[PDB]
């Protein structure tokens, strides 16, 4: 179920009914590839199959040399957000891997199995996964065939098989080389769908968390980092940093806002108001997580994946701005201007239309064509029976998501202000800031008659 409410009084709309999936922490996994130490091949074999193997081996050797170079380097209201270090956790685990004998532990731990839990020297337990064993393959399948005294290859399949196995190593290095050892999203070369699902299943997390991550692997990939760490002692290791979702299934809602202007015929005599607090809101541990950059959240059906690094923690009273922008308990954030330009905001279940001046604003159906022409002011139409909206030369398609919309009638609040004392130059203000500014303009007028 999804619903949406449009508030005519404040030219805004809230879509409710969504469930949260907030990233709260990080899990760090060490992914290793075992490499083979390959010395010179003293044959000048002109056999066509030996030549292709030797060419593939040069690509293999250049990849290792390339990664060794990489491992020598250390890997409206948005402006209110803090500044994190997105891979501080992953890089911290990587630093430990550079200590003496730490790589040897992972390597010997993964000698019998390809998946193990290793305790690092500092005490943290990390899942370690070997995704490709080239050391075993090269030492057990291709070294004898190349080094043969005869110096020729029996069949075509060995050349092809090596190219298949080596390809993954070549692609991983390619990505790291153009991302300075840190990639996001995590591609299928770094971690296949099978390996990731298996890693999630072996993680020390609840069963609910495992299910959520397994059914939304594409979002997990986009919120994960792969950090190139060490390549030493025949081991290539990179750290994959997976999101931990510590908040699940709490109510979330999306606030959409659009400019609300007076509609006088005199061109520049109009004043405008826009709620600046648009973005995502989720209930979280007794407060509300507010994500001003709504483009940092991904909506899948009715589940919203957000990252708390891009959030503020606000008192739950922030919700009062939707039903009463003048409430005394929370200072609702707004901006002011005199730029009464036309535009539309496409919501979850409809469209807000701010239509001013001489702009042509209409809504059309695919079958019947234009079914509503908007007048001056801020208005709203539901997506039921409506397919497109036009504001000036801009055509907007509306979302065809199923769900009920409610039109909450109300007097546009822009009509309550006197333009002679209306502060219309505020880019980052609020209800209370506009109030105190009006009184500072009214006191300069009041204390003049006080002399008379």
């Amino acid at each position, epitope marked *: 179920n999804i619903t949406e409410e449009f508030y005519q009084s404040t030219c805004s709309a809230v879509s409710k009914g969504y469930l949260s999936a907030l990233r709260t922490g990080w899990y760090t996994s060490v992914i290793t590839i075992e490499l083979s*130490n390959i010395k010179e091949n003293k044959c000048n074999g002109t056999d066509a199959k030996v030549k292709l193997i030797k060419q593939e081996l040069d690509k293999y050797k250049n990849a290792v040399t390339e990664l060794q170079l990489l491992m020598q380097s250390t890997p409206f209201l948005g402006f209110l957000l803090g500044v994190g270090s997105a891979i501080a956790s992953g890089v911290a685990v990587c630093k430990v891997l550079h200590l003496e004998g730490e790589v040897n532990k992972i390597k010997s731990a993964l000698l019998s199995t390809n998946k193990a839990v290793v305790s690092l020297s500092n005490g943290v337990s990390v899942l370690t996964f070997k995704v490709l064993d080239l050391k075993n393959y090269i*030492d057990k399948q291709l070294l004898p065939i190349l080094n043969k005294q005869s110096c020729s290859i029996s069949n075509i399949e060995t050349v092809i098989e090596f190219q298949q196995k080596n390809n993954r190593l070549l692609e991983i290095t390619r990505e790291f080389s153009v991302n300075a050892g840190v990639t996001t999203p995590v591609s299928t070369y770094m971690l296949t769908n099978s390996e990731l699902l298996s890693l999630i299943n072996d993680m020390p997390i609840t069963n609910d968390q495992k299910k959520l991550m397994s059914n939304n692997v594409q979002i997990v990939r986009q919120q994960s980092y792969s950090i190139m760490c060490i390549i030493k002692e*025949e081991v290539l290791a990179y750290v994959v940093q997976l999101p931990l979702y510590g908040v699940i299934d709490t109510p979330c809602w999306k606030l959409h806002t659009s400019p609300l202007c007076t509609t006088n015929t005199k061109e520049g005599s109009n004043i405008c108001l826009t709620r600046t607090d648009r973005g995502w809101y989720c209930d979280n541990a007794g407060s509300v997580s507010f994500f001003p950059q709504a483009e940092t959240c991904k909506v899948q059906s009715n589940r919203v994946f957000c990252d708390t690094m891009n959030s503020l923690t606000l008192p739950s009273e922030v919700n009062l701005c939707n039903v009463d922008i003048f409430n005394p308990k929370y200072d609702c954030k707004i901006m002011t201007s005199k730029t009464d330009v036309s535009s539309s905001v496409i919501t979850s279940l409809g469209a807000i239309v701010s239509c001013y001046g001489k702009t042509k604003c209409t809504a059309s159906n695919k079958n019947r064509g234009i079914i509503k022409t908007f007048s001056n002011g801020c208005d709203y139409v539901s997506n039921k029976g409506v397919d497109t909206v036009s504001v000036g030369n801009t055509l907007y398609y509306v979302n065809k998501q199923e769900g009920k919309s409610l039109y909450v009638k109300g007097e546009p609040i822009i009509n309550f202000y006197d333009p002679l004392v209306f502060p219309s130059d505020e880019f980052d203000a609020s209800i209370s800031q506009v109030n105190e500014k009006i009184n500072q303009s009214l006191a300069f007028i009041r204390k003049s008659d006080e002399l008379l």
Partner: antibody, heavy 127, light 111 residues
Framework: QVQLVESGGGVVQPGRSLRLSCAAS????????MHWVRQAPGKGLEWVAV????????YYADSVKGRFTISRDNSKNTLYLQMNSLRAEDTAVYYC????????????????????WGQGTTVTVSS | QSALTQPASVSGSPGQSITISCTGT?????????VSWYQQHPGKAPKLMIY???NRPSGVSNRFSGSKSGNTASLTISGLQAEDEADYYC??????????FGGGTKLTVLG
């Protein structure tokens, strides 16, 4: 001096486990491969197992795979050879030999040979 | 592991030259250069004489030479001496990622 000294030449009954020890000195131990070679009384030599420079990739003989496990400790410059389910045919003098080819290589073909040998400890199984 | 075919006994006199056989298959001997020879005096540990087909380390004389044709490697001792009377073995990489030894040859200088 490049020398390999194995010790622990005791007696053990069949079916019981035994652990061989081989010490090293006078050379960079964490750069060479190590071999185990046994020799039955009067009979010829027989290859047993090989461990690479860091003990990651071992190699065992077909007549031995599954029963013996060879390991290495670079922090002590020592080579080991675990032996489980000993049978009467294991009566042999187990030599401790180095590989022929310094380097961080992992393939048995790069160090199949032996250049420096130990003295050998007589391992006797008898109930 | 299938052993390597070596002649059991080889006789010779001081000043002569003699050859020891070491027959394998296309996997062990007749396929790779990785074939070595070892001299073992009774009591003392074996000693490396020829590494690879013909290469020899420092210490051993010019009288020890190695060769290989087909599936058989050959060790030649030119100008025999009483110090040469010992057992000789041949090793080889086995293509199956192990190492295999030979049957052994007891070279006796005729006194």
């Amino acid at each position: 001096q490049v020398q390999l000294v194995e010790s622990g030449g005791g007696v053990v009954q069949p079916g019981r486990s035994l652990r061989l020890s081989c010490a090293a000195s006078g050379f960079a131990f964490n750069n060479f491969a190590m071999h185990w070679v046994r020799q039955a009384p009067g009979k010829g030599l027989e290859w047993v197992a090989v461990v690479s420079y860091d003990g990651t990739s071992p190699y065992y003989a077909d007549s031995v795979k599954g029963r013996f496990t060879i390991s290495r400790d670079n922090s002590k410059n020592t080579l080991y050879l675990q032996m489980n389910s000993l049978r009467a045919e294991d009566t042999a003098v187990y030599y401790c030999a180095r590989g022929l080819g310094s380097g961080s290589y992992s393939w048995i073909g790069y160090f199949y040979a032996m250049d420096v040998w130990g003295q050998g400890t007589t391992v006797t199984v008898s109930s | 592991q299938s052993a390597l075919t070596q002649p059991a006994s080889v006789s010779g006199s001081p000043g002569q030259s003699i050859t020891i056989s070491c027959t394998g298959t296309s996997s062990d001997v007749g396929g790779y250069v990785y074939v070595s020879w070892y001299q073992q005096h009774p009591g003392k540990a074996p000693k490396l004489m020829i590494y690879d087909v013909s290469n020899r380390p420092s210490g051993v004389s010019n009288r020890f030479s190695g060769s290989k044709s087909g599936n058989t490697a050959s060790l030649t001792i030119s100008g025999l001496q009483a110090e040469d009377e010992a057992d000789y073995y041949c090793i080889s990489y086995t293509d199956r990622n192990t190492v295999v030894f030979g049957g052994g040859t007891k070279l006796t200088v005729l006194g």
